[PDB]
Design a protein around this ligand. Structure first.
Ligand SMILES: CCCCCCCC/C=C\CCCCCCCC(=O)O[C@H](COC(=O)CCCCCCCCCCCCCCC)COP(=O)(O)OCCN
Ligand SMILES: CCCCCCCC/C=C\CCCCCCCC(=O)O[C@H](COC(=O)CCCCCCCCCCCCCCC)COP(=O)(O)OCCN
Ligand SMILES: CC(C)CCC[C@@H](C)[C@H]1CC[C@H]2[C@@H]3CC=C4C[C@@H](OC(=O)CCC(=O)O)CC[C@]4(C)[C@H]3CC[C@]12C
Ligand SMILES: CC(C)CCC[C@@H](C)[C@H]1CC[C@H]2[C@@H]3CC=C4C[C@@H](OC(=O)CCC(=O)O)CC[C@]4(C)[C@H]3CC[C@]12C
Ligand SMILES: CC(C)CCC[C@@H](C)[C@H]1CC[C@H]2[C@@H]3CC=C4C[C@@H](OC(=O)CCC(=O)O)CC[C@]4(C)[C@H]3CC[C@]12C
Ligand SMILES: CC(C)CCC[C@@H](C)[C@H]1CC[C@H]2[C@@H]3CC=C4C[C@@H](OC(=O)CCC(=O)O)CC[C@]4(C)[C@H]3CC[C@]12C
Ligand SMILES: CC(C)CCC[C@@H](C)[C@H]1CC[C@H]2[C@@H]3CC=C4C[C@@H](OC(=O)CCC(=O)O)CC[C@]4(C)[C@H]3CC[C@]12C
Ligand SMILES: CC(C)CCC[C@@H](C)[C@H]1CC[C@H]2[C@@H]3CC=C4C[C@@H](OC(=O)CCC(=O)O)CC[C@]4(C)[C@H]3CC[C@]12C
Ligand SMILES: CC(C)CCC[C@@H](C)[C@H]1CC[C@H]2[C@@H]3CC=C4C[C@@H](OC(=O)CCC(=O)O)CC[C@]4(C)[C@H]3CC[C@]12C
Ligand SMILES: *[C@@H]1O[C@H](CO)[C@@H](O[C@@H]2O[C@H](CO)[C@@H](O)[C@H](O)[C@H]2NC(C)=O)[C@H](O)[C@H]1NC(C)=O
Ligand SMILES: *[C@@H]1O[C@H](CO)[C@@H](O)[C@H](O)[C@H]1NC(C)=O
Ligand SMILES: *[C@@H]1O[C@H](CO)[C@@H](O)[C@H](O)[C@H]1NC(C)=O
Ligand SMILES: *[C@@H]1O[C@H](CO)[C@@H](O)[C@H](O)[C@H]1NC(C)=O
Length: 1395
């Protein structure tokens, strides 16, 4: 262009721009105008940097759409900066140094750094809660910078004058407000209301000024909620309907509790007597807290139930409805808002076992079914809908992003330059003197022989460090030191030899030699610091050598790639998430700081845990709520700082954090992706005995053939199969009567043992019959038969032990409990579970491959924890007071309080789950990674002190970092890898079989395909006209939208009528509610009667006309007739369900929805795939429950085991199994069955059965719980995958070819033109000149018409061309094979053919 601007340069366009409206003007395509936006390099025209053209305005070489008067300035980085040049009043001019200077500062990047040097410093000064008095001065300094920035920007573009001003960018005006207060509070009397100074922590958003990557990623994040639509509508609808159901059932059922026994007035007025003390009235008697009872082992209140299956409390107590609600009164069902909150808590899967147990105890066990109905509809499907929608949105965005560049692309490194001469002294390190040593070292260091050897020396070391535990003697330390020294020596020898073998110049090639160098030097320098002092965690980083297997293991490379992609390639989302967490923590602390000082009030300095008085605790609470535990802290709030603030803040942070984490997870996963039967057997050992092919003419030859034919005929009958299935079902079901009450029932044991004998009899006979039927092919080549063989063998050895009378040997009794595998025979009879078990068994190797690396990555942390927390958990306690540690002032170590054990009331004890060895470490890590029971482990860890020393309250605070790091690493990337592997394997299996799904059989295939068909339209008018007047003035209103609008208004009014319900009120509410309900029922009945003669009997179609009838009118008249009895009202439990059917009137609005219909269609699509999974899960639950019934029958009642939740009978065991199947709390069940001490168990107990003791053995319980958890996780993953696959597969419309009626118009016109008979003929010699001008372009060109001479055309008469066959071929081109519209045309031609 030019070196500098001239005054007359812009005149040529200024004299013409203003006349565009009249002279300039007298196909628009609004486009980005060939890219060329700000903050980009964009080398496209020249591609060569200028010499000294930096920091000057340019002539705006750009399309006129974005030129006007603006100009572009570039920096040394060629950053495009646009500035519109217009008059700014005063004496200012676009060509004046006061603007040249501002532009030159704005374009330059230096002051950019300045900004980044300021705000981060602010982020430190803002994190203090007790600032020093002198920091005020520093505050001014900060302001004295920020305003500067704003000033320069104004000087470049203007304030708000013409265009492209400082206030046109959305990100700009945010800083404006930051300036306001920066000059306001200094010179104004502050308002009466304080705590407004928390606005300052919004300038952290200014961090989005670091780079454009933050801006584009924020735009990407915000460009997903618009796609995410109507899914929240469906979620709100489901939550509302479930809350409405829940209100009608458990209303006022959370106040039940039992009080001590009453006594009559005993004369006088208003005087209730009890144990010699008199109370004034009933209100003041039922409200005193002393008159209640506490559940044993906990500081809570017991609840009663009047039903036969709701529990009770001991004698001397009667249960009534009085008092306040449990948990400070924030959980209840009295009103709609609390019910909504409880249902939302149930959706999130927060601590819901508490509410589960409370509701079950108060109302009854039979109500558990209700919970079974919510989880399946609230815990999985809505979450999966959200997941699938966001995944589709992200995939579409990435597809568009890559397609943009795909379309677009089609259409020095030596700063010092002084070390090169040093290379003249390098490389040639062999020196002029010759040596044969180098050749020898090069030869001996050869990969396929020595390298494997070194690998061995790495594995054993990993085991050698694994030998760390409690209570060793000096020998173990000696061996550990010797082994460590030997391994370090061998490593240093390898290094020294390798560097001599391969020249130092080539040594640093891939960086793994660098890794070896740093690990060797670190190990040596750690070995050097081994004296009396300087002892620390000497593992340091020598555990890193475990990763050196990366060469030999092609699986850990994927984990390394994922970890690497977590930084750099996708390194901006982590920054955004960190910024969000930081700002949320700071705002929470600022808001809720000075409201926790009143919560101690005891023990002279006992501060409750999880507070917000400091930055660290706020960060911990933010991390915890991100993990998925928020209700407990919300309860701690809302009683010290208000109720309408914590709710909003917590909901906002939860939503934002979950969205960000989920998007990061998806992005990382996608990046990581980037007739004789066979006689005996084959021709094997037959060379020794060809004794089968013998004379078949005599009896010895014919008998075997006849018998085998007979057996083949016998096994083929269906009656035999049904008999066997019935026997299997009965045998499986007969094991439910083995509870603790079997001894009392004298007349059931004999029947049970007779059945036990008969089952084995029939099974052995059946097995032998099949054994003689087929041959030796089965039981040895078929997979299914081996299981039956093994079970029959177990039963056979059991029966031979029983019959011989030697069943009192001992370990023989162990096989008796192994009968719980009997129900497993039903895994091959129904088609059913066969497909799902096949799919599950076809994926084992991938699971093993992932499991190996998982165990290694947890073993490293187990070793670290074993070192760091060895023997720091013991404490001695006073038995009478309970299980609380005393103090450090009196008792300090074990010796002191073992010397104080004079009267026999001090007991030393250690936590159930600890870190005393590697196995306990594995158990603790499994407990932590599932977020169940981690609180006790964390509390013990923080409470730690010296070796076997008594704990000190919060002595080692900074040990939360280890657990935070573990949760970040081991619970996120391993999950990503597992999900990716499973998805890859499942998709590969899907591609292998073909275009057919896996979890479906033939019958379900037929149903799926048949009901998939869509498209059925029939808007006929079968409306008679007895008199056009009377019906003609109403049917017009019927057709208009006014009718349906009034209908939805009536539905909404009914919804708001059912809105208002609470506990007992005055009758004036009840009467009004009943009157409104009656009016709405009346209007609905009238509405349904308006049908009358409007549609006659022609309305019985697929439309929603039977649904509303049968759901609304029959149910409402039934309920109202049940209510008008007016004689008596017994069994209110049998009364609420009657009016529960009124909720069916709220489900009619779906008919007029938009996407809810499609999502319900997805439900209907998916159900068959979930049926089989449910069947398999139920079978697994049954077998595990019957197995567990026989081991934990007489365990002590403590912690998570109560009288209503135990293993003493079938129903309670099933309830516990349902509770645990979602990993909803199993520490409380594992703890009681783990203890084995005389302080907590009595080995001598008068058990009703021939057994001793009161507690079991953990060695079986640990396996019992672990295997069940693993199996449940694996099955739930399969359900998840099937649901999402179906949901994102049904998102398609395509075309079903429904338009075929308007096809014969052209043919009718042609016939009317030439011959109206539909049987005419044509000739190509005339066609080539006749078929030239045709409208409705459904025809072909003239050359293409000639090719139709021998294209599906019979030859009749003198080589004439049949028109009807041409019509059939033409209609067959699109869909002429089956239909309802073209079928009439084909039938018309066929009928014309007849005559
Ligand atoms: C950003 C929103 C832009 C909205 C504009 C859309 C295109 C409209 C083009 C046809 C109408 C143009 C009329 C026009 O410019 O009139 C002018 C008034 O225009 C307006 O009402 C809007 C002026 C916008 C200037 C920038 C204001 C920014 C406000 C924050 C956004 C003339 O005002 P006047 O000299 O007092 O004359 C009063 C009697 N007319
Ligand atoms: C899943 C992997 C787990 C396997 C089972 C782990 C332990 C099973 C029981 C073996 C006995 C045991 O734990 O003894 C403890 C095991 O001793 C060890 O340190 C063994 C180290 C094995 C490392 C395996 C990897 C020792 O306790 P002590 O009080 O020192 O005697
Ligand atoms: C830039 C964003 C993404 C992260 C910002 C977080 C850190 C840069 C901040 C948060 C808390 C800050 C700490 C808060 C408190 C202290 C103690 C302070 O000195 C004291 O010990 C003061 C004692 C007292 O509190 O009275 C020195 C700074 C330091 C370490 C701060 C250093 C900077 C920290 C780690
Ligand atoms: C205390 C008060 C004054 C705070 C007010 C803040 C909002 C007015 C700001 C803060 C963040 C801004 C958003 C940050 C990022 C973007 C992306 C940006 O995307 C684009 O430029 C793409 C084109 C388009 O979205 O139309 C559009 C503006 C928007 C939504 C901004 C709109 C204005 C927002 C909401
Ligand atoms: C980063 C920011 C934007 C997060 C959101 C903060 C505000 C929405 C919060 C911070 C302080 C809050 C206020 C703190 C104290 C009170 C007093 C409280 O009751 C009174 O004492 C009312 C007295 C009156 O109205 O005169 C009513 C809510 C209110 C105004 C709060 C309203 C909500 C506020 C402004
Ligand atoms: C905290 C300490 C004790 C352990 C972790 C230290 C890491 C921050 C450093 C140490 C060694 C570094 C590695 C040393 C050498 C290289 C080779 C280097 O290779 C290249 O530059 C070329 C890559 C290619 O071949 O394509 C890539 C980075 C990498 C793996 C480095 C990645 C970062 C590492 C692991
Ligand atoms: C490693 C990540 C996960 C920490 C996340 C929070 C950090 C940004 C902040 C929160 C509180 C900060 C601590 C607050 C006070 C101290 C005390 C003081 O250190 C000590 O007295 C020695 C103990 C140590 O440095 O670990 C200075 C650093 C430290 C640990 C700070 C280090 C940085 C911490 C952990
Ligand atoms: C890198 C991988 C392989 C493991 C990561 C583990 C870290 C999260 C651990 C290892 C060493 C730990 C540190 C080891 C020692 C200390 C000193 C400790 O200080 C006290 O106990 C002070 C109390 C007092 O003596 O008065 C506080 C925890 C801290 C910083 C630990 C914080 C957590 C660390 C960094
Ligand atoms: C709190 C912990 C225990 C739950 C962690 C569950 C998620 C990490 C899993 C469950 C369902 C998974 C999704 C199921 C199906 C698909 C297939 C595919 O689409 C991309 C991955 C995705 C979204 C999966 C990503 C990983 C998800 C979100
Ligand atoms: C352990 O608990 C017992 C029971 O509370 C404490 O004994 C109390 O004090 C003396 C003995 O110290 C007894 O005579 C009293 O009967 C007990 N109760 C009360 C209310 O005083 C005992 O002191 C506790 N501590 C130790 C170390 O034994
Ligand atoms: C109940 O007794 C009180 C106190 O003696 C008395 O004032 C009151 O009138 C009595 N109420 C009756 C008798 O209804
Ligand atoms: C503690 O309460 C439980 C609850 O069932 C009861 O069984 C037990 O007997 C109580 N303990 C004592 C010592 O009475
Ligand atoms: C306590 O009251 C209940 C109420 O049903 C009664 O059954 C029981 O006998 C009473 N017990 C005593 C000791 O008064």
């Amino acid at each position: 262009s030019f070196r500098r601007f001239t005054r007359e340069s812009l005149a040529a366009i200024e004299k013409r721009m203003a006349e565009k409206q009249a002279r300039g003007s007298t196909e628009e395509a609004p486009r980005p105008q060939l890219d060329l936006q700000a903050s980009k390099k964009l080398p496209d025209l020249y591609g060569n940097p200028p010499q000294e053209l930096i920091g000057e305005p340019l002539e705006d070489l750009d399309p006129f759409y974005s030129t006007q008067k603006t100009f572009i300035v570039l920096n040394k980085g060629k950053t495009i900066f646009r500035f519109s040049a217009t008059n700014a009043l005063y004496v200012l001019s676009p060509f004046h140094p006061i603007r040249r200077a501002a532009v030159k500062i704005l374009v330059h990047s230096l002051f950019n750094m300045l900004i980044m040097c300021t705000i981060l410093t602010n982020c430190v000064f803002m994190a203090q809660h007790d600032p020093p008095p002198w920091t005020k001065y520093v505050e001014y300094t900060f302001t004295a910078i920020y305003t500067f920035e704003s000033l320069v920007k104004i000087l470049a573009r203007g304030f708000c004058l013409h265009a492209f001003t400082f206030l046109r960018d959305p990100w700009n005006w945010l800083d404006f407000s930051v300036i306001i207060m920066a000059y306001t509070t200094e010179f104004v009397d502050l308002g009466n209301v304080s705590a407004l100074r928390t606005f300052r922590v919004l300038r952290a958003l200014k961090t989005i000024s670091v780079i454009s990557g933050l801006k584009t990623i924020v735009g990407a994040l915000i460009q997903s909620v618009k796609k995410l639509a109507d899914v929240m509508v469906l979620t709100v609808f489901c939550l509302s309907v479930f809350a409405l159901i829940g209100l009608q059932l458990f209303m006022g059922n959370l106040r039940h509790k039992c009080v001590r026994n009453f006594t009559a007035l005993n004369g006088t007025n208003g005087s209730v007597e009890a144990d010699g003390l008199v109370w004034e009235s009933l209100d003041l008697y039922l409200s005193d807290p002393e008159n209640y009872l506490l559940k044993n082992g906990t500081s809570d209140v017991l609840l009663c139930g009047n039903s036969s299956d709701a529990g009770t409390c001991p004698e001397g107590y009667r249960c009534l409805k009085a008092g306040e609600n449990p948990d400070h009164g924030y959980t209840s069902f009295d009103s709609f808002a609390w019910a909504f909150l409880a249902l939302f808590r149930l959706m999130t899967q927060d601590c819901w076992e508490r509410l589960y147990q409370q509701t079950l105890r108060s109302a009854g066990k039979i109500y558990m079914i209700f919970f079974m109905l919510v989880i399946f509809l609230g815990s999985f499907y809505l979450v999966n809908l959200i997941l699938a929608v966001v995944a589709m949105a992200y995939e579409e965005q990435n597809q568009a992003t890559i397609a943009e560049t795909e379309e677009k692309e089609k259409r020095h490194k030596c700063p010092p330059c002084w070390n090169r001469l040093a290379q003249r002294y390098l490389i040639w390190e062999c020196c002029p003197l010759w040596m044969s040593i180098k050749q020898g070292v090069k030869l001996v260091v050869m990969d396929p022989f020595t390298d494997l050897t070194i690998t061995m020396c790495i594995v054993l070391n990993t085991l050698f460090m694994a030998l760390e535990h409690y209570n060793m003697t000096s020998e173990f330390e000696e061996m550990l030191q010797v082994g460590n020294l030997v391994f370090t020596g061998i490593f240093t020898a390898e290094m020294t030899f390798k560097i001599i073998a391969l020249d130092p110049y080539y040594y640093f090639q891939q960086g793994w030699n660098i890794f070896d160098s740093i690990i060797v030097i670190l190990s040596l320098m750690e070995l050097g610091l081994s004296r009396m002092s300087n002892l620390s965690v000497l593992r340091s980083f020598r555990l890193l050598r475990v990763f050196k297997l990366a060469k030999s293991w092609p699986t850990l490379n994927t984990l390394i790639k994922i970890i690497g992609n977590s930084v750099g390639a996708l390194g901006n989302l982590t920054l955004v998430l960190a910024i969000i967490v930081f700002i949320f923590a700071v705002v929470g602390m600022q808001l809720f700081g000075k409201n926790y000082s009143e919560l101690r009030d005891s023990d002279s300095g006992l501060l409750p845990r999880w507070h917000m008085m400091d930055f660290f605790h706020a960060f911990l609470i933010i991390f915890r709520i991100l993990c998925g535990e928020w209700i407990e802290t919300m309860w701690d709030c809302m009683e010290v700082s208000g109720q309408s603030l914590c709710l909003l803040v917590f909901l906002l942070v939860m939503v934002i954090g979950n969205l960000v984490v989920l998007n990061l997870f998806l992005a990382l996963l996608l990046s990581s992706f980037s007739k004789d039967p066979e006689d005996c057997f084959t021709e094997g050992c037959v060379r020794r005995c060809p004794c089968c092919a013998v004379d078949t003419t005599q009896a010895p030859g014919k008998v075997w053939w006849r018998l085998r034919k007979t057996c083949y005929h016998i096994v083929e009958h269906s009656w035999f199969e049904t008999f066997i299935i019935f026997m299997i079902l009965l045998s499986s079901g007969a094991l439910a009567f083995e509870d603790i009450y079997l001894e009392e029932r004298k007349t059931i044991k004999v029947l049970l043992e007779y059945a036990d004998k008969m089952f084995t009899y029939v099974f052995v006979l059946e097995m032998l019959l099949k054994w003689v039927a087929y041959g030796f092919k089965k039981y040895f080549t078929n997979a299914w038969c081996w299981l039956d063989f093994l079970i029959v063998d177990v039963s056979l050895v059991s029966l031979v032990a029983n019959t011989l009378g030697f069943a009192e040997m001992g370990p023989i009794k162990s096989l008796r409990t192994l009968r719980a595998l009997r129900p497993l025979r039903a895994l091959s009879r129904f088609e059913g579970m066969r497909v799902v078990v096949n799919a599950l068994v076809g994926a084992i190797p991938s699971i093993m491959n992932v499991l190996l690396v998982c165990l290694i990555f947890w073993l490293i942390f187990s070793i670290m924890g074993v070192n760091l927390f060895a023997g720091k958990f013991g404490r001695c306690i006073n038995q009478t007071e309970g299980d609380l540690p005393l103090n450090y002032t009196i008792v300090n170590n074990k010796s002191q309080c073992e010397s104080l054990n004079l009267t026999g009331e001090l007991y030393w004890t250690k936590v159930k789950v600890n870190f005393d060895n590697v196995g306990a470490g594995y158990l603790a890590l499994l407990q932590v990674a599932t977020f169940k029971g981690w609180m006790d482990i964390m509390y013990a860890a923080v409470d730690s002190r010296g070796y076997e020393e008594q704990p000190q309250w919060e002595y080692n605070l900074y040990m939360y970092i280890y657990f935070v790091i573990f949760i970040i690493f081991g619970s996120f990337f391993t999950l990503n890898l597992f999900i990716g592997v499973i998805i890859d394997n499942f998709n590969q299996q899907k591609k292998k079989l073909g275009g057919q799904d896996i979890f479906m059989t033939e019958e379900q295939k037929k149903y799926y395909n048949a009901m998939k068909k869509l498209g059925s339209k029939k808007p006929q008018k079968p409306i008679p006209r007895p008199l056009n007047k009377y019906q003609g003035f109403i049917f017009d209103i019927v057709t208009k939208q006014a009718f349906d609008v009034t209908i939805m208004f009536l539905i909404c009014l009914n919804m708001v009528t059912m809105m208002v319900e609470t506990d007992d009120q005055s009758p004036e509410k009840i009467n009004i509610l009943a009157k409104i309900n009656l009016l709405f029922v009346a209007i609905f009945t009238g509405e349904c009667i308006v049908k009358l003669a409007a549609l006659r009997h022609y309305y019985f179609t697929n439309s929603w006309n039977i649904f509303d009838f049968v759901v609304v009118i029959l149910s409402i008249v039934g309920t109202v007739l049940s209510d008008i009895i007016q004689k008596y009202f017994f069994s209110p439990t049998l009364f609420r369900v009657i009016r529960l059917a009124r909720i069916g009137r709220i489900l009619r609005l779906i008919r007029g929805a938009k996407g809810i219909r499609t999502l319900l269609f997805a439900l209907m699509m998916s159900l068959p795939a979930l049926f089989n999974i449910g069947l398999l899960l139920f079978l697994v639950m049954f077998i595990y429950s019957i197995f567990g019934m026989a081991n934990f029958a007489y365990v002590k009642w403590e912690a998570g085991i109560d009288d209503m939740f135990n293993f003493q009978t079938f129903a309670n065991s099933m309830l516990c199994l349902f509770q645990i199947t979602t990993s909803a709390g199993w520490d409380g069940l594992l703890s009681p069955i783990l203890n084995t001490g005389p302080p907590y168990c009595d080995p001598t107990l008068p058990n009703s059965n021939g057994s001793r003791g009161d507690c079991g053995s953990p060695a079986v319980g640990i396996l019992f719980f672990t295997t069940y958890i693993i199996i449940s996780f694996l099955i739930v993953v399969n359900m998840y995958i099937a649901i999402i696959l179906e949901n994102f597969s049904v998102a398609t419309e395509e075309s079903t070819e429904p338009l075929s009626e308007d096809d014969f118009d052209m043919f009718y016109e042609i016939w009317e033109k030439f011959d109206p008979e539909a049987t005419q003929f044509i000739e190509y010699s005339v066609l080539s000149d006749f078929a030239d001008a045709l409208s409705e372009p459904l025809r072909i060109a003239k050359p293409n018409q000639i090719s139709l001479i021998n294209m599906d055309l019979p030859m009749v008469s003198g080589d004439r061309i049949h028109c009807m066959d041409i019509l059939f071929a033409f209609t067959k081109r699109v869909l002429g094979e089956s239909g309802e519209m073209d079928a009439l045309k084909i039938q018309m031609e066929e009928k014309f053919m007849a005559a």
